[PDB]
Design a protein around this ligand. Structure first.
Ligand SMILES: OC[C@H]1O[C@H](O[C@H]2[C@H](O)[C@@H](O)[C@@H](O)O[C@@H]2CO)[C@H](O)[C@@H](O)[C@@H]1O
Length: 565
C-alpha cells in the first residue's frame, strides 16, 4: 500500500493483534471515511528507516519503544502533541518510555514482559529455578514430553537468563546510558549463556528452536513450559492446554531479568496525515473499546490507558507479567540498541550451535555493541563562513535571507554563494513540515558532538546548544522546483556534450544552528548555521527519471568535504 493523503497505513508486528487493530481502523473509516490499512511486513523495524527516508513508509508504526529513539535520532518520527487532558489518561511510566531528548515521539500502548508459561496438567508445580530444569526434562522425556522450549533465535528470549547474574546492555550513570560500558561479556552474562549452552549440549533443548517451533510444541502439549509475552496467550486459549503464567525461574538465586518493552505507535515524520493519525490513536485506539478489540485479538499486557488497565488488573496473567517486569529492566531507547541486539543475537546463535565458545561469542558481541558506530554521516560543516540562522518564520516565506536555509538549491556545497533559487523557493506544500527546533546537544563546558564542534569552531565555549531543522522533500515538490525558470536556465547553461541530458543539483534539506547568547568579535558570538544536510538530485540521461538521495559520507567534487557526523 502506498502512503497518500486521505488514508492511513499502519505497520505492526505479525505477532500482535493486527486484526483487532484493523477493526478499530474500520470503525475509524465508518465515522470519517478515511481508509485504514494495517500491514505486518517481515522485519518492519529494519525496513522502516529505509522506506521512511525515501518517504514511502507507513503513516503509523507499532513497535517496542527501544527502536524509536534511533528513529528519532534520524528525525523519522513526528513529535506527538497530546493535550494535558489526554496525557493524564495514560500512566506516566509509559509516557517516559517514549521520550527522546525530552520530547514525546510516540504514543505508548502497553507494557509487555516475558513470563514463564507452563502446562498445569503436565506440570502442576512449575520449577522456581533454572538449575532444576535438567532433572525435570529427564522425567518429562520419560513421559514423552520435554521441560522447556522457547525462541532461541531472538536474544529477547535468552536475555532474561543472561542478565540474571549480572549481564547488562548499557550502564546508566550520570543521568545517561554510557555506550562505552557494555555488560555483555562479564561473569554474570558468561554464566547465563553457559547454562543455556549446557542445556543444549545435554539435549534438553535444540539450538534450532525458533518462535514457531516453540509455540507449536507448547500449544500441542509436547513441552511442559515455554517463555513468551501476553500476545501469545490467545493462541494457547484456542488450544486444549490448561496453562498458567508465572515468574521466570531464578538463576544462581537471582531473578531472571527480562527486558521490559513498551509497545508504542510512532507517527512518520514524512506522513501527510499526521492529524488523522493523531485522531485515530487518541480518540479510537487509546480508548477502552479500541484496546479491547486489539486485546481480544492478541493480549497486550498492562495497557497504558488507566481505565482499561484498571479493568484488566484482576487478571493473574497480567499480574505475572507485572511481576516479571518489576524484576527486569526497562529497555533503553538509545540509538545503539539496534547494534546491541544484533551483537547479542549473533553471540547466542554462535554459542548455542557450537560454532564459538561462550567466551569468544560474548567477547565479539561486547566489541560490536560498544563499537556501535556506523552512524552514516550526512552533516557537513560550513567552513570559512558564519551564516546567521534563518528565522523560523522566514523558512516558509519563499525568500529567506540566509544562504543556508532549507529549500535552497546550489550547484555544490562549495558553491553556497550561488543559490540557484534565491528568493524563488518553490512553496512548501502543507504536507511538507519543517521539523525543528530540535535540541540535539546541550553544551556544558568521545561521545557527542562537542568534539566536532570544538574542533570546528574557534569560540566553541561561547555557544550552549545545537538546534536542528529538518525537512523531507517529496517527489512532487522537487518536480515543481526543477521546472521553475531559475533551475531550467541554470541547467541550460551546460556547454558539454557528455553532460547533455544530464544534471545534478543539491538541496539544503537540513540545518544545524549553534545557539549561544585568532581574534573574533560579537559577530562570531552570534547564532549561525554550523552544519547542513544535502539531498543530491540527479538525472543520468534522457530515458532515466531523476533521482534524489541524501548525501552521505562525503561530497563528490574537488575539495569534496567529508561528513563530520
Ligand atoms: O530479539 C531482539 C529484539 O527484542 C525485542 O523485540 C521483541 C519485541 O519487543 C516483542 O514485542 C516480541 O515481538 O518479540 C521481539 C523479539 O523477537 C526488541 O524490541 C527488538 O528491538 C529486538 O530486535
Amino acid at each position: 500500500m502506498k502512503i497518500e493523503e486521505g488514508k492511513l497505513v499502519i505497520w505492526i508486528n505479525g505477532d500482535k493483534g493486527y486484526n483487532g487493530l484493523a477493526e478499530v481502523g474500520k470503525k475509524f473509516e465508518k465515522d470519517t471515511g478515511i481508509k485504514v490499512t494495517v500491514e505486518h511486513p517481515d522485519k518492519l523495524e529494519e525496513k522502516f528507516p529505509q522506506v521512511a527516508a525515501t518517504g514511502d513508509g507507513p503513516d503509523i508504526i507499532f513497535w517496542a519503544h527501544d527502536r524509536f529513539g534511533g528513529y528519532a535520532q534520524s528525525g523519522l518520527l513526528a513529535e506527538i502533541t497530546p493535550a494535558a487532558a489526554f496525557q493524564d489518561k495514560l500512566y506516566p511510566f509509559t509516557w517516559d518510555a517514549v521520550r527522546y531528548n525530552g520530547k514525546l515521539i510516540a504514543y505508548p500502548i502497553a507494557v509487555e514482559a516475558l513470563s514463564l508459561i507452563y502446562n498445569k496438567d503436565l506440570l502442576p508445580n512449575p520449577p522456581k529455578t533454572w538449575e532444576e530444569i535438567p532433572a525435570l526434562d529427564k522425567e518429562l522425556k520419560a513421559k514423552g514430553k520435554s521441560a522447556l522450549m522457547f525462541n532461541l533465535q531472538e536474544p529477547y528470549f535468552t536475555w532474561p537468563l543472561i542478565a540474571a547474574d549480572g549481564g547488562y546492555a548499557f550502564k546508566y550513570a550520570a543521568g545517561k546510558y554510557d555506550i562505552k560500558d557494555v555488560g555483555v561479556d562479564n561473569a554474570g552474562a558468561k554464566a547465563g549463556l553457559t547454562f543455556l549452552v549446557d542445556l543444549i549440549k545435554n539435549k534438553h533443548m535444540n539450538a534450532d528452536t525458533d518462535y514457531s517451533i516453540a509455540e507449536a510444541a507448547f500449544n500441542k502439549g509436547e513441552t511442559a513450559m515455554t517463555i513468551n509475552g501476553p500476545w501469545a496467550w490467545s493462541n494457547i486459549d484456542t488450544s486444549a492446554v490448561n496453562y498458567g503464567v508465572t515468574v521466570l525461574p531464578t538463576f544462581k538465586g537471582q531473578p531472571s531479568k527480562p527486558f521490559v518493552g513498551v509497545l508504542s505507535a510512532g507517527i512518520n515524520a514524512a506522513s501527510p496525515n499526521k492529524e488523522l493519525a493523531k485522531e485515530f490513536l487518541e480518540n479510537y485506539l487509546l480508548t477502552d473499546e479500541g484496546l479491547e478489540a486489539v486485546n481480544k485479538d492478541k493480549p497486550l499486557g498492562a495497557v497504558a490507558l488507566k481505565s482499561y488497565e484498571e479493568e484488566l488488573a484482576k487478571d493473574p496473567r497480567i499480574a505475572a507479567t507485572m511481576e516479571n517486569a518489576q524484576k527486569g529492566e526497562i529497555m533503553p531507547n538509545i540509538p545503539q540498541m539496534s547494534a546491541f541486539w544484533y551483537a547479542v543475537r549473533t553471540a547466542v546463535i554462535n554459542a548455542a550451535s557450537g560454532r564459538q565458545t561462550v567466551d569468544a561469542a560474548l567477547a565479539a558481541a561486547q566489541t560490536n555493541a560498544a563499537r556501535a558506530a556506523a552512524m552514516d554521516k550526512c552533516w557537513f560543516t560550513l567552513d570559512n563562513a558564519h551564516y546567521p540562522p534563518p528565522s523560523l518564520d522566514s523558512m516558509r516565506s519563499g525568500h529567506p535571507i540566509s544562504p543556508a536555509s532549507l529549500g535552497h538549491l546550489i550547484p555544490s556545497l562549495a558553491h553556497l554563494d550561488q543559490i540557484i533559487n534565491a528568493k524563488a523557493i518553490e512553496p512548501f506544500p502543507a504536507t511538507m513540515d519543517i521539523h525543528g527546533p530540535t535540541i540535539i546537544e546541550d553544551f556544558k563546558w568521545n561521545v557527542g558532538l562537542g568534539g566536532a564542534f570544538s574542533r570546528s569552531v574557534a569560540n566553541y565555549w561561547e555557544f550552549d546548544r545545537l538546534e536542528r531543522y529538518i525537512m523531507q522533500p517529496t517527489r512532487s515538490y522537487v518536480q515543481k522546483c526543477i521546472e521553475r525558470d531559475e533551475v531550467k536556465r541554470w541547467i541550460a547553461k551546460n556547454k558539454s556534450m557528455m553532460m547533455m541530458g544530464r544534471w545534478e543539483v543539491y538541496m539544503i534539506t537540513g540545518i544545524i544552528v549553534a545557539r549561544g547568547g585568532k581574534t573574533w568579535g560579537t559577530s562570531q558570538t552570534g547564532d549561525f548555521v554550523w552544519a547542513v544536510r544535502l539531498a543530491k538530485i540527479t538525472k543520468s540521461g534522457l530515458h532515466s527519471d531523476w533521482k534524489m538521495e541524501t548525501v552521505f559520507g562525503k561530497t563528490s567534487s574537488f575539495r569534496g568535504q567529508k561528513a563530520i557526523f
